[PDB]
């Protein structure tokens, strides 16, 4: 009855942690922020429509110059757009068209993508030859690639349906650190601003904070009732929201190790596919299966605005590093730039 | 205005034309999703249509270029990736007829044939596949003839009251699978009794695909 004694001991440890969290919940952020003024009329307009994809868009990523962005679609194309002019800078043909994620290196020298091929492909954007070339195919995951984010030109973190995350050395192509402990498909990850930590969201309805260099889970955050599809760090690195199938966004503070706020409306019942913060953190933007993007007041939980410009699922979105614009990508094959 | 952006705008149009021309090829593609429990006969069909996640194969027949995707090894929740295959022309669902009498494993909940029905129920009724034609390859008919001589169908279907002839058992099994379709008026199942030696099955999928194209063209041309 060793398995019996352990299964009961885990319940006591869970109860201890629950009690410790309750002990420091002397108030809620909502009552703390009652005094501050609401943001009011958020009237965002479409300034650009990026046309040229011929299938559903599943991912995009802004470059660090806040001008270039990459998009990935099931038409087998990775397109880099100049968002100021709408010019297509590159059109990269993918060996496998079943992509689910893409990423832009902070240096701008590389893009990444992957999906149901279980491979994260690295693409060199700055070749002497003049075209884009696959520089590395990172193989070793046993489920689909759901997300990836560069740490730098030589390191990238991936998430996979195999329930693990991995840190890769791009030069050698080897998994140098693995991140195990999730019990369901990992759908999304978000890098801390200092790149020392990242958080992951999984189909076990939990989020986990991982220490990159030590390779283990520091904290585990529960509260969601269904799939976590999306996750994003607060700009100061001390919190992160979690888009979920439960039509909710539950901001979790790291240092207080618990939920601070939920963002939901009684008339919103669809899943959330993507989340991102504005530059100051005041606005939480989230993309919904109901074809809309909702803009939440992150401090007061009131909805501030709506972006309704797509004819199909919003599958991805992102805010520029300078905060000047948000891009939304959609199953309807278009991207739109808003500010 | 547009000093050196003129060559950039020109480059954007030159690669925007190649996107259009690459989508014209893809628009002629027949996309096939191969499904089925392990050992149902999927790899035999793959060999028949011929000479790391999504294994892919392509072939030409009667001037139609087919592209078939075998989900294969994909250890994950289907609900998170199945929507990627919205828009495939047809699903080919392979069912092992001879699996009906397979003994339960050590901790197996149900027998192999009923697991196939559960997969078929989930796929046929999936919200992403409402308007997708399902082609059913009932394979290993040769082995079925040997097994049915000595092993009664009641092992698989306790409610079955017919005889253990091929004709009665095959018709009943086909009916049991086709009855799972809750959207018969909007979705059509194309059932074939293929085997390891059958060669008209590739012709069968071509005929079934041609009907699907008619439905798509009638929908596009406004007649549907």
């Amino acid at each position, epitope marked *: 009855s060793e398995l019996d004694q352990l299964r009961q001991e885990a319940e006591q440890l869970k109860n201890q942690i629950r009690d410790a969290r309750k002990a420091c919940a002397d108030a809620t952020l909502s009552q703390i922020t009652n005094n501050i003024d609401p943001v009011g009329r958020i009237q965002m307009r479409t300034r650009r429509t990026l046309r040229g994809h011929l299938a559903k868009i599943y991912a995009m990523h802004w470059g660090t110059d806040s*001008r*270039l962005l990459v998009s990935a679609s099931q038409d087998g194309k990775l397109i880099i757009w*100049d968002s100021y*002019t709408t*010019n297509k*800078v*590159h059109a990269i043909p993918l060996r496998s068209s079943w992509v689910m994620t893409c990423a832009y290196a902070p240096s*701008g020298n590389y893009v990444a993508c992957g999906g149901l091929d279980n491979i994260c492909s690295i693409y060199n954007l700055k070749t*002497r*030859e*003049g*075209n884009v070339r696959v520089s590395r195919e990172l193989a070793g995951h046993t489920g689909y690639l759901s997300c990836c984010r560069f740490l730098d030109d030589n390191q990238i973190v991936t998430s996979s349906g195999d329930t693990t995350c991995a840190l890769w050395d791009i030069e050698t192509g080897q998994q140098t650190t693995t991140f195990t402990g999730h019990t369901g498909d990992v759908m999304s990850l978000s890098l801390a601003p200092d790149t020392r930590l990242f958080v992951s969201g999984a189909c076990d309805a939990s989020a986990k904070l991982w220490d990159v260099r030590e390779g283990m889970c520091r904290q585990t955050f529960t509260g969601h009732e269904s799939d976590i599809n999306a996750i994003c760090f607060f700009p100061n690195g001390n919190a992160f929201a979690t888009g979920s199938d439960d039509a909710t966004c539950r901001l979790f503070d790291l240092r207080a190790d618990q939920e601070l706020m939920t963002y939901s409306h009684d008339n919103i019942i669809c899943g959330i596919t993507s989340v991102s913060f504005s530059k100051s953190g005041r606005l939480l933007l989230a993309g919904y299966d109901d074809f809309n993007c909702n803009v939440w007041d992150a401090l007061k939980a009131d909805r501030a605005g709506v972006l309704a410009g797509h004819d199909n699922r919003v599958s991805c979105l992102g805010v520029t590093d300078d905060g000047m614009a948000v891009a939304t990508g959609s199953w309807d094959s278009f991207l739109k730039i808003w500010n | *205005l547009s*000093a*050196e*952006d*003129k*060559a*950039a705008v*020109e*480059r954007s149009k*030159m690669i925007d034309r190649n996107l259009r021309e690459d989508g014209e090829k893809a628009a002629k593609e027949v996309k096939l999703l191969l499904l089925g429990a392990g050992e149902s006969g999927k790899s035999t069909i793959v060999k028949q249509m011929k000479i790391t996640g999504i294994v892919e194969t392509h072939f030409t027949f009667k001037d139609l270029y087919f592209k078939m995707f075998d989900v294969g090894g994909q250890r994950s929740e289907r609900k998170k990736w199945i929507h990627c295959f919205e828009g495939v022309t047809a699903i080919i669902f392979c069912v092992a007829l001879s699996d009906y009498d397979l003994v339960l494993a050590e901790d197996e909940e149900m027998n192999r044939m009923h697991e196939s029905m559960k997969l078929f129920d989930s796929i046929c009724n999936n919200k992403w596949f409402t308007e997708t034609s399902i082609i059913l390859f009932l394979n290993k008919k040769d082995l079925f003839e040997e097994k049915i001589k000595r092993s009664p169908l009641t092992i698989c279907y306790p409610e079955y009251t017919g005889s253990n002839t091929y004709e009665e058992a095959a018709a009943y099994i086909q009916c049991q699978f086709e009855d799972l379709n809750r959207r018969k008026d909007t979705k059509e199942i194309y059932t074939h009794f293929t085997c390891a030696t059958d060669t008209k099955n590739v012709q069968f999928v071509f005929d079934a695909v041609t009907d699907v194209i008619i439905k798509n063209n009638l929908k596009e041309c406004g007649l549907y």
Partner: single-chain antibody, 235 residues
């Protein structure tokens, strides 16, 4: 390994015709806007013709329009210049130059080896390098200057000024594109600055191999025009 190898040069009588070729290897030739630039024996660089990737756009210099025809054969990775009514003033070394144009690209980043042609016996932007030569010693710091008759700063924010270096006996090499950007493979001891009309290329701790002729060039509008060049002599 990027290669551009010109051929077809030689001695020709005035009024005759001659076809130059440029053979490309080691890169994606098709997606590169080619450029013919020529250099008279004891003179500077002069832009001759441009054909874009896809051949959709062709520009000629005034002194050659009507007489010269530029073309490319993409399947065989070859560039052509069909010349007719050749005059004595056409005697020059002809360089084939590749140039790809997109956001953040580096145009004019590779020049061919050159082929020698010998012929027997206004609105254009003027580029000015008032200093024709400069004596230098290793380790010292130099500043070469260039000026334009029109502002090179565009409403998009870019200033379309390029710096090239021609070492003795070799083809010109890109150093700076759009006034401040360091070309790939160029040591960080070069730097460029300026504003609108006046521009400066600065070298820190100049070495031995740095000696040569430095040309500025505007890419604001066609025809592209070069400065007369500034030579760096050893003391």
């Amino acid at each position: 390994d990027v290669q551009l190898v010109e051929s077809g040069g030689g001695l020709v009588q005035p009024g005759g015709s001659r076809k130059l070729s440029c053979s490309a290897s080691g890169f994606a030739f098709s997606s590169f806007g080619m450029h013919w630039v020529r250099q008279a024996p004891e003179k500077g660089l002069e832009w001759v013709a441009y054909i874009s990737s896809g051949s959709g756009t062709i520009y000629y210099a005034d002194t050659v329009k009507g007489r010269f025809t530029i073309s490319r054969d993409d399947p065989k990775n070859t560039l052509f210049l069909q010349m007719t009514s050749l005059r004595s003033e056409d005697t020059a070394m002809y360089y084939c130059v590749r140039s790809i144009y997109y956001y953040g690209s580096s145009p004019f980043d590779f020049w061919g080896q050159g082929t020698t042609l010998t012929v027997s016996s206004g609105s254009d932007i003027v580029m000015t390098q008032a200093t024709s030569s400069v004596p230098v010693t290793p380790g010292e710091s130099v500043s070469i200057s260039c000026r334009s008759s029109k502002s090179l700063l565009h409403s998009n924010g870019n200033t379309y000024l390029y710096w090239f270096l021609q070492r003795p006996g070799q083809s010109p090499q890109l150093l700076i594109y759009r006034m401040s950007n360091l070309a790939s493979g160029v040591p960080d001891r070069f730097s460029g600055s300026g504003s609108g009309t006046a521009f400066t290329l600065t070298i820190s701790r100049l070495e031995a191999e740095d000696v040569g002729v430095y040309y500025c060039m505007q890419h604001l509008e066609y025809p592209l025009t070069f400065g007369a060049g500034t030579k760096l002599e050893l003391k």
